Amino acid sequence: MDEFEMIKRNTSEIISEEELREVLKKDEKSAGIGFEPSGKIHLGHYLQIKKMIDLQNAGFDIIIELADLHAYLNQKGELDEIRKIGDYNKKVFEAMGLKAKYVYGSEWMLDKDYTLNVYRLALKTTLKRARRSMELIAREDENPKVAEVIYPIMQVNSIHYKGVDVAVGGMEQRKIHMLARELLPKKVVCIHNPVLTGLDGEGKMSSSKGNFIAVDDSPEEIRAKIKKAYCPAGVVEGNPIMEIAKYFLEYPLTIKRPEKFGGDLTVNSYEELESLFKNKELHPMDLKNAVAEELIKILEPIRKRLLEHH
Amino acid sequence: MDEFEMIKRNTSEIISEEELREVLKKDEKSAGIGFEPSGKIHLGHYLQIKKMIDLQNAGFDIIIELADLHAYLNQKGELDEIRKIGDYNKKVFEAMGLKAKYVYGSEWMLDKDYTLNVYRLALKTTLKRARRSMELIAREDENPKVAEVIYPIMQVNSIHYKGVDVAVGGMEQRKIHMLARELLPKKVVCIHNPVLTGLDGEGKMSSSKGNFIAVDDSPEEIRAKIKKAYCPAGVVEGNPIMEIAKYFLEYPLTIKRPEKFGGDLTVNSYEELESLFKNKELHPMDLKNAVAEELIKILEPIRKRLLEHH
Ligand SMILES: CC(C)(Br)C(=O)Nc1ccc(C[C@H](N)C(=O)O)cc1
Ligand SMILES: CC(C)(Br)C(=O)Nc1ccc(C[C@H](N)C(=O)O)cc1
């Protein structure tokens, strides 16, 4: 692959491709993503950090916002506690191999100039639009707070303030990103990563829904989680195990199985793996076993770096 | 009257009376109101400044917020223009005889501490509540902006930040004030003045509805405005002319009229005036003539101070 196709790989959408082409030519180009600090860092975070790495390899300076005020506004607790978890997440992202500028949003979100532009943007952001942009982000609340509609403006403002050429996020960030593209003088290139399905297939992988594999889960726990995971034979869509094979595993992939079940199977691409699964040539139990053992090897250096701290 | 009854006079409500009693005892007590800067200063503004004067006479230090960022958030234009009109309004309020601390909201509304508490309060203010509190304040907008729900939080925050014991406003400010009483550690005493009816009786006196008498209107213009004004015989409620007699005129009041219409009439109180009007003992034309001529004499020193600037 070339640089553009390496950035595009395993993304849901790039907004837009020609604009990304314009960016790649620059000697200096920056790319940002922000994370509300999370008690566990899971495969959904890893997918996005993997993509920030792809950009760093393509010559981007990477900015990681530890979004403490966003988490505060989205009801994750008190600021000092959120910042502690932010610092923990930083260590995890470094353990994943991302050397970047890790910044707390509150480092600039209280500047007078920034705050004035929050108010400028509030004047151009309709309440309906702001709520639409938060539908997949806002913490469930039967009595939604004003903080919910401040949140999207502040993300747009930070895209403006930190001056990134590229914003990266999960597909759930797309409407906030389409606000930023509409409201800001410089249109940011937006790279949207897929939203992983949760292990039970009930919804999306979520830190608060307990349907995730954490990057520092133990081998036994990964095996237990994958064993129980939704994985209907032949079904690829909404299949979290097929998702993990697509987004995290390396190919060629040797799938070990007994000779009585057709013997070990070497598949050279996820597309062949999908073909072998769509028609029950590969059983869920054998897919799960290989997905488990290979995911373990992938996360091992991460877990190990984190374990060494003890 | 004593101090409490002088403050209460011609108010719609005091929240609450016992709390105001506690305040009056203090050697130092402050009272605030804020005005979005307005191209014309009208009898509605004067009624509130008259009440700030009542408080100043009762030993309050008065704070007048020229609410430039509020007007900005409520779509009155650009900040520099709004501030010009703010400075004009200050001159008008001084011409009314109020010597006070006149402060632009933007002087403190961009402080880091203030802005952080905006976000704290956004977490405790529901979007429904915030919109309810703005129903009589927000500029008409088919596509309401996020600025609309930031506005009420910022007013509450300023009540907190500027530390007033008493907040004064028209009845349309009551729901914002009931937020401040619920959210802030120190419960502010709220003094609500009536909302004057517009001259056509169609609604409330408004700077943007052209149904007002401005304090610097010329005598001929006051007469023309009062002549055309809604004033049905016997009807006192919603009658702007009866309102002006109640809130602005001094009693005893001599009402001049021809001998053929019963001759000049001296009424010692608005209550007697209301009695003489409820049963058509006093005609609208005669009420209007006296209300016009006496309102002119009341506003004359104000108009004159303002004219001297030319
Ligand atoms: C400033 C830059 C460009 Br790094 C940026 O994109 N900031 C940002 C991004 C995402 C989030 C949280 C996010 N909405 C979520 O749901 O987790 C917060 C802040
Ligand atoms: C800070 C203090 C205590 Br002086 C205060 O009350 N500020 C305040 C009051 C009213 C308004 C505007 C008002 N909502 C309107 O509709 O005109 C803006 C700011």
From Swiss-Prot, chains A, B:
ATP binds at S207. InterPro entries: aa-tRNA-synth_I_CS, aa-tRNA-synth_Ic, Rossmann-like_a/b/a_fold, Tyr-tRNA-ligase, Tyr-tRNA-ligase_3, Tyr-tRNA-ligase_arc/euk-type, Tyr-tRNA_synthase. Homodimer. One of its GO terms (biological process) is tyrosyl-tRNA aminoacylation. This is Tyrosine--tRNA ligase. Residues 151-158 are annotated as: Tyrosine. GO terms for molecular function: ATP binding; tyrosine-tRNA ligase activity. L-tyrosine binds at G32, E36, Q173. The keyword DNA repair does not apply. SUPFAM superfamilies: Nucleotidylyl transferase. It catalyses: tRNA(Tyr) + L-tyrosine + ATP = L-tyrosyl-tRNA(Tyr) + AMP + diphosphate + H(+). Keywords: Aminoacyl-tRNA synthetase, ATP-binding, Cytoplasm, Ligase, Nucleotide-binding, Protein biosynthesis. Changing K288A: Decreases the rate of aminoacylation more than 200-fold, without effect on tyrosyl adenylate synthesis. Changing D286A: Decreases the rate of aminoacylation more than 10-fold, without effect on tyrosyl adenylate synthesis. Changing E107T: Confers specificity for the non-natural amino acid O-methyl-tyrosine. The gene is tyrS. A motif ('HIGH' region) lies at residues 37-45. Its EC number is 6.1.1.1. Pfam families: tRNA-synt_1b. Residues 228-231, 283-288 are annotated as: Interaction with t-RNA. Catalyzes the attachment of tyrosine to tRNA(Tyr) in a two-step reaction: tyrosine is first activated by ATP to form Tyr-AMP and then transferred to the acceptor end of tRNA(Tyr). It is found in: Cytoplasm. Belongs to the class-I aminoacyl-tRNA synthetase family. TyrS type 3 subfamily. It is an enzyme of class 6 (ligase). One of its GO terms (cellular component) is cytoplasm. The record marks N143 as: Interaction with t-RNA.
